[PDB]
């Protein structure tokens, strides 16, 4: 009888930076996808390995809701087999991804006149992220032969950068709130079912 708490994910006041993306496990609830259907603000709403129409007629062991904020032209990196600074260093989906990606423009919430410097992304990393891996380290990146010893300098760079979202940016550079729903079928029983399989 319990409904899945999609509202507290999609309609949260504050969203995580992509490098420190937020994950909420959704279990033991009825997945009413109608609220997701009827939100006419979604620029992106697509699924992989499953049709978004058949979500109310399916059951899963767990549904993982990952959320973060990136630029508009970076939303496409939140997809199987994609590359770029966000997919390589911040949030990586697997090539076998089963789930849905939802993104909507959030210029009205996450932009500030003079810049909102609270949203960050990782720019440097010695290796790409594994799927669903998170790196929240703040260690100086050694871009040259000389070791850094934690001191920023020549070929020694801080790994995070700030978006600095302003409302006057073009839509490509404007902030977009992203929610990735992952569909897991590992250890029975299934706990998240649509109202049509319930």
């Amino acid at each position: 009888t319990n409904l899945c708490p999609f509202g507290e994910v999609f309609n949260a006041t504050r969203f995580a930076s992509v490098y420190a993306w937020n994950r909420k496990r959704i279990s033991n609830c009825v997945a009413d996808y109608s609220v997701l259907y009827n939100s006419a603000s979604f620029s992106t709403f697509k699924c992989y390995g499953v049709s978004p129409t058949k979500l109310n007629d399916l059951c899963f062991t767990n549904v993982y809701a990952d959320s973060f904020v990136i630029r508009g032209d970076e939303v496409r990196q939140i997809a199987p087999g994609q590359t770029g600074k966000i997919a390589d260093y911040n949030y990586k989906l697997p090539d076998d991804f089963t789930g849905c990606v939802i993104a909507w423009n959030s210029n009205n919430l996450d932009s500030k006149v003079g810049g909102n410097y609270n949203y960050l992304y990782r720019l440097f990393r010695k290796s790409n992220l594994k799927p669903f891996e998170r790196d929240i380290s703040t260690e100086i990146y050694q871009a040259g032969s000389t070791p850094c010893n934690g001191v920023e300098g020549f070929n020694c760079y801080f790994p995070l950068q700030s978006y600095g979202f302003q409302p006057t940016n073009g839509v490509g550079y404007q902030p977009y709130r992203v929610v990735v729903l992952s569909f897991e079928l590992l250890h029975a029983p299934a706990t998240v079912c649509g109202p049509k399989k319930s």
Partner: nanobody
Framework: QVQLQESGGGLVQPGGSLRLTCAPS????????IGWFRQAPGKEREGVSC???????YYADSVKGRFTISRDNAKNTVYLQMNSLKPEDTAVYYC?????????????????????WGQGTQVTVSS
């Protein structure tokens, strides 16, 4: 990024039909998803119709009964048949492409789903 060229635009009477064509250059549309977008004078860019690499489709509500998107990977071409054209359909129509190695299934289709864009072709429906 990839090179995209549109064709089939023009001026047509209301109720008439047009067939937009998106031709890739320098690659094949096999792994790619293709979408059609339009921007009317004095308005924002809107998604019209999209097709996945698995041939699943998206249609905006305003074109649902009138437009049909199709894929021909052998001829390396995506078509947008546009029947029963109305004056509100007057806009510049853009083709868009995005790698889609797995099969994507759309509920909506927006500009945030594509990285490559064509120059566009003009569609005008006036009597």
């Amino acid at each position: 990024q990839v090179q995209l060229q549109e064709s089939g635009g023009g001026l047509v009477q209301p109720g008439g039909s047009l067939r937009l064509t998106c031709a890739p250059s320098g690659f094949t549309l096999d792994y790619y998803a293709i979408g059609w977008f339009r921007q009317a004078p004095g308005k924002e860019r809107e998604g019209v119709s999209c097709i996945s690499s698995n041939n699943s489709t998206y249609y905006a509500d305003s074109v649902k009964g009138r437009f049909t998107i199709s894929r021909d990977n052998a001829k390396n071409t995506v078509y947008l048949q546009m029947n029963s054209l109305k004056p509100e359909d007057t806009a510049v129509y853009y083709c868009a492409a995005e790698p889609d190695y797995s099969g994507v299934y759309y509920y909506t289709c927006g500009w945030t789903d594509f990285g490559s864009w064509g120059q566009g072709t003009q569609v005008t429906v006036s009597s």
